Amino acid sequence: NSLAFNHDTLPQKVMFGYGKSSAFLKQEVERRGSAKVMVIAGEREMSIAHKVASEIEVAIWHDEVVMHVPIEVAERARAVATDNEIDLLVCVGGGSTIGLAKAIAMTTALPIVAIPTTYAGSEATNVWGLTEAARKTTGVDLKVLPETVIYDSELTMSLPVEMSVASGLNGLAHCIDSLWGPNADPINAVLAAEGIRALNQGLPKIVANPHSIEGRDEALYGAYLAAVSFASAGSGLHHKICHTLGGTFNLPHAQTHATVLPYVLAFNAGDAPEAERRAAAAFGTDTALEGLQRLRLSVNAPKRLSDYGFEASGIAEAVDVTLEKVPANNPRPVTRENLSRLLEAALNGEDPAVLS
Amino acid sequence: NSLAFNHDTLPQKVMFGYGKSSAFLKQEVERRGSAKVMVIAGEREMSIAHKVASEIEVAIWHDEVVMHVPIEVAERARAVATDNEIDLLVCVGGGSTIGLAKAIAMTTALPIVAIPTTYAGSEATNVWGLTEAARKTTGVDLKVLPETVIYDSELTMSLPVEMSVASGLNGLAHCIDSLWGPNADPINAVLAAEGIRALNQGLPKIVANPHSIEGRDEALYGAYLAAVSFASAGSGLHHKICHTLGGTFNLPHAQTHATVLPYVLAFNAGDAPEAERRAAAAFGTDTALEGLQRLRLSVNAPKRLSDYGFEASGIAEAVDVTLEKVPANNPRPVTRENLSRLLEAALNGEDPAVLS
Structure with a gap:
């Protein structure tokens, strides 16, 4: 038996640096030319998100982030993105927050810039997850993989x-x-x-x-x-x-x-x-x-x-x-x-x- | 002076295995639904390219591969691609063969499946080269990165x-x-x-x-x-x-x-x-x-x-x-x-x- 494998390397930009999230985001939104940025952060994470997104103009601040991404939550979020003509999703938080961004991407194909605050790594996968009627469902789609990940360790320091x-x-x-x-x-x-x-x-x-x-x-x-x-x-x-x-x-x-x-x-x-x-x-x-x-x-x-x-x-x-x-x-x-x-x-x- | 970087992970599939190139190429062409494949290989690799493409239909076999990719050679290859409504580029050989496939992708945006026979690694870069008016230059363009690379060490057995x-x-x-x-x-x-x-x-x-x-x-x-x-x-x-x-x-x-x-x-x-x-x-x-x-x-x-x-x-x-x-x-x-x-x-x- 000789070496044999089939590998897929997924496209992603990673911007890494302590204290640089707001400056990295500005650069990314400039690079993209985004006109209507939607910031997704859990109600309890939302003050940090404001600071992170301080250097860009934000069209929508969406704080309904819920564990296991209930389909009704995902439906409401898609509607907000769609009704507000959003052209960039920006998520600041953990897996459930990144998960909501993914759920919106599934049907809108909007690009995601993920700004993570924990070590769960959802920002690095093309795997989405939804709950509906107590039933969790998952799948793979390149549309749900964040195009850019901004890692700023300052944002993880308040995690106990x-x-x-x-x-x-x-x-x-x-x-x-x-x-x-x-x-x-x-x-x-x-x-x-x-x-x-x-x-x-x-x-x-x-x-x-x-x-x-x-x-x-x-x-x-x-x-x-x-x-x-x-x-x-x-x-x-x-x-x-x-x-x-x-x-x-x-x-x-x-x-x-x-x-x-x-x-x-x-x-x-x-x-x-x-x-x-x-x-x-x-x-x-x-x-x-x-x-x-x-x-x-x-x-x-x-x-x-x-x-x-x-x-x-x-x-x-x-x-x-x-x-x-x-x-x-x-x-x-x-x-x-x-x-x-x-x-x-x-x-x-x-x-x-x-x-x- | 803390850790800081901006990293682009480029999209690519790599299929690896001794003796599997013809089966992998088939799989790759079928997955794409490609109907008009162009195989690019120098005269000295053509016999081998025919064996590699033996499980697929090939619309065009192109053997004008020239070191340093002269612009006139790139221009002829691009015309063959466009005139024949080619929908996939497949290159079998080394740097200069892969180089010509890249030159074609620069203007046509056609996808490339690279089947390398040396260790120069052009198949894994988004760097192109051309020679015009006695001047060789190189540049970068994502369209020149082959979307898929097929590595079959059987094709390297005869490399001196x-x-x-x-x-x-x-x-x-x-x-x-x-x-x-x-x-x-x-x-x-x-x-x-x-x-x-x-x-x-x-x-x-x-x-x-x-x-x-x-x-x-x-x-x-x-x-x-x-x-x-x-x-x-x-x-x-x-x-x-x-x-x-x-x-x-x-x-x-x-x-x-x-x-x-x-x-x-x-x-x-x-x-x-x-x-x-x-x-x-x-x-x-x-x-x-x-x-x-x-x-x-x-x-x-x-x-x-x-x-x-x-x-x-x-x-x-x-x-x-x-x-x-x-x-x-x-x-x-x-x-x-x-x-x-x-x-x-x-x-x-x-x-x-x-x-x-």
């Missing part, structure tokens, strides 16, 4: 240490799960490793100093590369487990990713030796699980799903819904029984080494 | 070892110069280092066995990442020198790049510590230069520009033409004297360490 850490490990999970993702390839693999390197350097710095320019820059850069890698490599076992835990059991997104990650690594590591070594090298340790555990310890990462309401009684259904979602090419064959044992370890915070 | 080595070192130069390029950033940096790793591994395996699938795949993969890095980082000192030597003195392309590289590395290394350490790590050696020198010895690399007819009497002019083209941000300040000394070293193949 615990949430910053949780969110950073969500980004780290985009990197690690992608190393054995359904469409893993050498390119998305190098980018995932670089993401691990950056997040591993940045997150301890954030814990020690939440206004660390160096550390917040490393984390935000790392989150970017994590997401770009994930958009190419596709969702692996980790993301399928978390999809279920969030979708069926409504557990908190970031903390769930944070908690599930080390168990999936331990579960798959033995059967994905090349991924394991690359991750190891990115952490600067002999093994990847050692790298992750040390980081988790230094960062006081989440340890148990039971701390977010998940019970042992919910593992049967958890396994039941996820099992079919798992990629056929997951390094280690997944079974109802070994997926149940993984969730038991993540539920109660056992040593992940137990799943090796 | 000397050309393979010289062209591979051309690819290596794309990586190394990009490390201190005018728009060097952390992303093109990590890609450049991945290119160094792949080429350093691959080229010696090709010299050891010209039909090594492992080595041929590594070189081709390396060449891709080198060029993607370079498309982003822009032309640094090395490329400016080589452009002058190829344009004004008509020195052979791959050999000139191969020969000049160690001298530009030796010259800039001390003033680019972060770049030097990254290259060193990629080579797996203590310094970047010893890594490059070990590679060069192991592949019997080109040694001196005098082997291609360059003479000392031409250095003053080379320097004249190049000095003003050097990026203001080159690591070591470039003077008329030290650029002359650099070219004297390359002329006679002196120990590159003479420039450290």
